[PDB]
Design a binder for this molecule. Sequence first.
Ligand SMILES: [Zn+2]
Ligand SMILES: [Zn+2]
Lengths: 320, 320, 113, 113
Amino acid sequence: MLKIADQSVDLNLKLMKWRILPDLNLDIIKNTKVLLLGAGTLGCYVSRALIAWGVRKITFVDNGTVSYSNPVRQALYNFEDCGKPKAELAAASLKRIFPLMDATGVKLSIPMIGHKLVNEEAQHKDFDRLRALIKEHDIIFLLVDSRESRWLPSLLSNIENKTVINAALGFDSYLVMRHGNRDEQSSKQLGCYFCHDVVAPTDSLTDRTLDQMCTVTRPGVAMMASSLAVELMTSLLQTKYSGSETTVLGDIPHQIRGFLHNFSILKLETPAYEHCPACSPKVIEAFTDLGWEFVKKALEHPLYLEEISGLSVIKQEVER
Amino acid sequence: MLKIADQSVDLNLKLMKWRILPDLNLDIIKNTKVLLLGAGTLGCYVSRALIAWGVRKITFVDNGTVSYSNPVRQALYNFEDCGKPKAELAAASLKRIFPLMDATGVKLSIPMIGHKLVNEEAQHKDFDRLRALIKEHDIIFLLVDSRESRWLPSLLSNIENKTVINAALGFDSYLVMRHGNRDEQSSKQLGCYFCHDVVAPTDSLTDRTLDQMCTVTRPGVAMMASSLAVELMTSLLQTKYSGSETTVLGDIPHQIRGFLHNFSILKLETPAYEHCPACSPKVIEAFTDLGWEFVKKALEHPLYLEEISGLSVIKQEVER
Amino acid sequence: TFKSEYPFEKRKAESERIADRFPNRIPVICEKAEKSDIPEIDKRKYLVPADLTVGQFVYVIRKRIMLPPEKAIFIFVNDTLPPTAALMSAIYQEHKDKDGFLYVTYSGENTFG
Amino acid sequence: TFKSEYPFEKRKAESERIADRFPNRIPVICEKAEKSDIPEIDKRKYLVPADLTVGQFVYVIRKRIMLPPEKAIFIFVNDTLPPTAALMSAIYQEHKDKDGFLYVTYSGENTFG
Ligand SMILES: [Zn+2]
Ligand SMILES: [Zn+2]
C-alpha cells in the first residue's frame, strides 16, 4: 500500500505542473534537503507545508521535550506525547503521515550569545555539530524562539553559503524573510534578521519575567508565517524570469511582515548593513580567521561583537 | 495528567487576556459550538486553529473516507488511516491532541443542487439532519469542495440565523467571508458567497473532466484561509467598539481574498443582492412557506431557483 | 493588456470620442485576471449602457466568453468587488481610470476545500 | 497621535518654522506602533541632524525611550523598513509628509517560534 500511496501523492504534485504551471520545477523542491531549527509551533506547521509540497528530507533540531500546552499549538504532537523529546518525536510524526519521509530528529542545543558558556568542550561540540548539519542541508529554516538563538545559525549559514528562511512570531504579527548571501560578482546583498537594529543580540531569557514579556500569541500567526515561509521557499527555488524578480510561482520578496488586527501583509526589502552583528563583513572575516576562537568570545561578550562589527564606532560617533 | 494538561492550556489562553488584551472575551470563544461542514484540508487546519483558541465543541460533517493522497495535505490524518471514514476519524484525532475536546463526527451527505435526487426519503432525512446540526451549533464553517455543496448549508444557516464563515480555495488564491444575516431593525445586510455572480449553483462535478478543471492547489492557500477564517471568527465574537467596525481583536472584514503569487490580501465588502439564488428574500420566503417541498424543486431544477430569486427577470430584461 | 499596447493619449482620446458619440454607453475594458484559470476572448472593449447593472454586465461577460453555467466568476474593479445590483453608470463614476475607461477584471470563483 | 491633535495648517507651519531656523535638522515624529508591546515616552518630536544615519537615530529612540539592549525594534517609514545605513536626510527626502514632518513608527521585533 506504500507504493500506491506514493503514486497518489506524486500525481497530486505532477498535476499542478502538467495542467496548471508547466514551467514548474517540482524536482528541485523534492530533492531539497531541509534543516528546521526549532520543532515548536512554526517547526510543526512548516514541516507539514513542506511535505505537502513533496519535500522528502527534513531534519528537526530541537533540544526540548513536549510540554503539556504544546499539542494544541504544535501540530505534530499529541497528548500522549507529553514529556518525550520533540525533535525525534517530530520526525516520527512526519513518517506516520507519509512513511517514505526521510525525517530525522537531532536533540541539539544551539549555543546562545549572551549566555555564560557552561561546558567549553561540550558546547564546542554543539557548534561543530550545528555547522555540520547546516553544511549538509540546502535550505535552513530558522524557527527558534529567541533573538539570541538566531545569531549563531545566521552566521554559520552565511559562512556555509546556504539559503536561510527566517520566521518569527509576535502576538498579533509575524515576520518571514530570506537572509541575503554574499556574492563576489554582485555588490547587492540582502539584509538579515539582525540588519534592522543596532544592538548585539544577548541574553533576553535569563533575566526575563512576565513583566518583561509574555510569550503567548494568537494561533493564526504561526499558521500564516509557516505557509508563507514555505511558499517563499518554493518560489525562490524556481528560475526567475529574465527581466524581473519573479518566477513561475510568482514573487520572491526579501521580507514579509503580516498583521492580524487589520488582516494585512507588507512586502519589504532591506540591504545588508555593514555594521550588522551577524552579517557584517568584519564579522565574517573574524570567523574566517579565528573560527571558534572568535565565536566563543562573541558568545560570552556580546559587547565585543559590537566592537568587531563596528556598531560601537557608529554609537561612539553619535556619543560625541 | 489530564487535569494538569487542561490547566496548562487554559493558562496559555488566560495570559493573552491578563497581560496583553484585558478586554478579550475568552469565554464566548470557549463556549462556541462549532459546526465544520467538510473534514478535508480546510476542515483539518480550521479545527487545529480552533482548539488552539480554546474552542471545546467541534462537530465534523463529511461523508468521505481518508484517501491515499489526503494525509500530506489534511493535517488530522495519518497513512494508517487510509480507507476509514473521515468525519469520525477527525473527531478522534482532535481528542488525541486534547482529550477534553467534545469532538464529534457525522458521516452525512449534503444534498447537492443540480444533482438528481436518488432517494427522496433518504435525502429528505439528510436535509432535516443537516438543518438540526446547524440549529444546535453557533458558528457554521462552510469548508466543502464544490459550488453546489455551499448552497443548501447557506440557506439553512440563514434560515436558522447562524453566523456562517465560508472559506474556499483556488490554486493560488483563497476566499474567506462571513455571510450576512437578516435583521429587522437594520436595512443593511452583508452579501453571501452567491451574491457575486448571476447563475444558480448546479452540477459542476458529474460532467467534470481534467479538461474542465484540476483540483490541486498550492499547499499554502489552505493554511492561510484556515487561520484567517478562525481569526475572523474570534474577532467577530468580540463586542465591537461604539463608533467603528473594530473589536479588541481588530477588524471584522466581511470578505477577505488572498493571493500567493504576489503575497497579497484584500479586505472587501458587498451587500446582499436581492436576486441572489441563496439569500434573496424571495428564496427565503419560498422556504418559509413550503420548506422541503420548495427545496426539493430547487435541488433538481436550478433554473427554477433562478425563476424564484428573480435572476431570470434581470436576464430576460437584458435579453430584450 | 489594453494599457500595455496603448499610451494614455491614444486611450484618453477614444474615451472622449466614445462619450461625445454615445453619452448613454460606458467604455469598459474587461479582461481575465492574470493568474485566473478560466476562458477569455479577444473582445476586451465593451460599450455597455449606463442603466445596465453589474449583474447584467456579468451575464454578457460569461455569455460572450462562452463560460458554462456550472462555473462562477467574480469581477474586480480597482481591487474591489462591485455590488451586483449596482448600475454600471454608478460604478463608472467611482472607478473610471483617468484615461476615460472603466477597467474590469474577472476570474473564476474559488470552490475547493 | 500627533496628527490626531493638530491640523495640517498648524503642522505644516512648525515644519517650515523648523526648516527656516535649523536647515541642518530634520523634523521627525517618532511614536510606537499601535498594537506593539514596547515602551514609549511623551517625546514624539525630534529634530535630528541630516548626516545622522537611521541606525544612529534608532539608538536615540531606544536610549531616550529607556529600552533594554536585550530587546530589538524595527522602524517603519510609510510602511517600509528604511536601510539602517541610510542618512536621515535621504530618508526625509523620500518619505516626508506634505506637512513637513517625517513620520516614523517603531515596534518590538518578533522573536517567538
Ligand atoms: Zn545582517
Ligand atoms: Zn447572497
